[PDB]
Design a protein around this ligand. Structure first.
Ligand SMILES: O=P(O)(O)OC[C@H]1O[C@](O)(CO)[C@@H](O)[C@@H]1O
Lengths: 287, 310
């Protein structure tokens, strides 16, 4: 109950490249290794894990795991046989999302023209993998990255992407509308994909998209399958205060909702998706 | 009847000297593809079976390349039957060797082995056959000219033939090469349009009587000699194309002109990315400004390919 948080922090420690939701899956799966009250224990694990990270991916990635195991309980019921079919099905789920970023990269790196000049937001381990696969296919391009206050993740990305021998420019956070005509396409990594096909990414993604549709630059999103959250925002207030805030007055939301009309395509795990297509998949991921 | 062709795979003018010393001037690559692989493909596009290939000068390279080429496999509907002999010194010896072997029994295409074209000889062939049975062997040839403009890179100012044509029946009445000339002499006996906008293109559709007319008159050596020597005596007609490319590669100037025309897709079924020869080592991707890059090219950093690159 408290060692759960410690193990989750450890999965952050010895694996920074592993996603937050995957860390939640691993620590929750180990907690599963320790009838119907066990579903309540896993729901409590969801609450305690979302209470310390508050990303959309954690409360969605763990929430599919509350459903990917409870789908097997619809097939059969037991007391310890059900726990072992739970662990051999959860291990399959966990090893089926260790291959997510590679599949996204294989789908998305074919959308970058040679000699292109992309624009990306703060820091995505998926956008980084899309560009890593794009330079491994002998494409050459330029990357514009916004520094993306307050945590300056854009500088972390450009330091993590200069090793790939790519011309990367840490543009100012305010200057998206300036360099937006210098961009062939926009690749961002969603922190959660809501039910209408729009995304929830770090603050400033929305005005990256609104500028994009102002100049008809394609706005590509590279999310994963477990980031499909069941929310349906209609404006920026409809995003819950769980997700927006990690904690002369400062405001500081950390995420904002991007409308699905602004998004050209989503390169999720389960194939390239129109923003409409996402909704179907969400239905399929929750019957 | 089936359509045949005679392909003189040795140009008998010592023109690409010294490139002709180490590679035959039919096998040197135009745009990564040897010239014969254009004209052979040309004949395959026309509907030609039985494309006799006559090789004299360095027939070893030509035959060993043809048997490893596309048209020597049994899948191709254009059989070649390479004829190899050192007896040929000119085109006249080639068309005289057609007789005493009777290789042609209907009208055939005489390309000259380095033609590069996407011409469809079905309109011209049907017009030739129409006025062949009608006037009972009046016509012996139907030269194929491209409607060019006299100031063009493809016109080398070394062929530039001017003709006098009867516009109602397309009969050629006069024909001369205007290599060194300022004023053109047309005799008054031929009285009738006079055309200079004709790229020669060397795709004559000569009937088998032409092979007869080269043997009895042994003095002929080339097609220019034949057309000049029979317009003084049996009626060369012609057909003029306007929407299809055609040009041979007589010299290195018009080599550069035709190679720049192929890259710029003027010969559209024969572009480099089409891979009309089915080799695995000549695939391409036509990118943006006729920039074709083959497989595993590894372009450097900061290098600029502006346009028309292969
Ligand atoms: O690709 P990741 O690391 O899983 O996260 C994607 C998005 O979530 C953030 O890391 C935090 O919102 C953003 O920087 C990024 O755009």
């Amino acid at each position: 109950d408290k060692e759960l948080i410690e193990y989750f922090k450890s999965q952050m420690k010895e694996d920074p490249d592993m996603a937050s939701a995957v860390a939640a899956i691993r620590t929750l799966l180990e907690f599963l290794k320790r009838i119907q009250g066990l579903r309540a224990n896993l729901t409590s694990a969801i609450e305690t894990l979302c209470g310390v990270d508050s990303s959309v991916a954690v409360s969605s990635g763990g929430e599919l795991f509350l459903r990917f195991i409870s789908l097997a309980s619809l097939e059969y019921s037991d007391y310890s046989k059900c726990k072992k079919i739970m662990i051999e099905r959860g291990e399959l789920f966990l090893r089926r999302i260790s291959l997510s970023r590679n599949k996204i990269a294989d789908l998305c790196h074919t959308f970058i023209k040679d000699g292109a000049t992309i624009l990306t937001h703060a820091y995505s381990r998926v956008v980084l993998r899309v560009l890593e696969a794009a330079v491994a296919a002998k494409k050459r391009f330029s990357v514009y990255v916004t520094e993306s206050q307050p945590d300056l993740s854009g500088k972390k990305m450009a330091k993590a992407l200069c090793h790939l021998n790519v011309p990367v420019t840490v543009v100012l956070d305010a200057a998206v509308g300036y360099i937006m005509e210098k961009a062939d396409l926009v690749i961002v990594g969603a922190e959660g994909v809501v039910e209408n096909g729009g995304i929830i990414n770090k603050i400033g993604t929305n005005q990256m998209a609104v500028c994009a549709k102002a100049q008809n630059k394609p706005f590509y999103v590279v999310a994963e399958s477990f980031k499909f959250v069941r929310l349906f925002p209609l404006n920026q207030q409809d995003v819950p205060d769980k997700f927006k805030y990690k904690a002369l007055k400062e405001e500081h939301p950390w995420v904002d909702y991007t409308a699905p009309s602004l998004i050209t395509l989503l390169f999720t795990d389960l194939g390239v998706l129109t923003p409409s297509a996402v909704s179907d998949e969400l239905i399929k991921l929750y019957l | 009847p089936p359509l045949q062709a005679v392909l003189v795979a040795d140009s008998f003018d010592r023109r690409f000297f010294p490139i002709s010393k180490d590679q035959p001037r039919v096998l040197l690559p135009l745009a990564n593809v040897a010239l014969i692989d254009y004209t052979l493909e040309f004949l395959t596009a026309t509907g030609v079976q039985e494309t006799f290939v006559f090789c004299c000068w360095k027939a070893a390279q030509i035959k060993e390349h043809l048997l490893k080429s596309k048209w020597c496999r049994p899948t191709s509907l254009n059989v070649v039957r390479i004829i190899t002999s050192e007896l040929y010194r000119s085109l006249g010896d080639v068309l005289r060797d057609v007789d005493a072997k009777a290789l042609v029994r209907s009208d055939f295409l005489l390309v000259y082995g380095d033609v590069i074209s996407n011409i469809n000889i079905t309109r011209a062939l049907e017009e030739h056959r129409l006025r062949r049975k009608l006037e009972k062997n009046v016509s012996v040839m139907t030269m194929i000219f491209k409607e060019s403009s006299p100031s063009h890179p493809t016109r080398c100012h070394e062929d530039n033939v001017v003709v006098a044509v009867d516009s109602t029946t397309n009969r050629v009445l006069h024909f001369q090469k205007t290599q060194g000339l300022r004023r053109f002499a047309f005799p008054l006996s031929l009285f009738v349009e006079v055309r200079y906008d004709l790229l020669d293109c060397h795709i004559s559709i000569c009937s088998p009587q032409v092979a007869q007319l080269f043997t009895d008159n042994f003095d002929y050596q080339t097609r220019d000699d034949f057309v000049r020597g029979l317009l003084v005596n049996n009626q060369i007609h012609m057909h003029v194309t306007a929407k299809e490319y055609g040009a041979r590669v007589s010299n290195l100037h018009m080599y550069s002109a035709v190679c720049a025309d192929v890259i710029r897709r003027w010969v559209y079924p024969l572009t480099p990315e089409a891979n009309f020869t089915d080799s695995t080592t000549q695939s391409c991707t036509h990118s943006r400004h006729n920039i074709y890059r083959g497989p595993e090219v590894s372009l450097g950093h900061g290098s600029i390919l502006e346009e028309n690159v292969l």
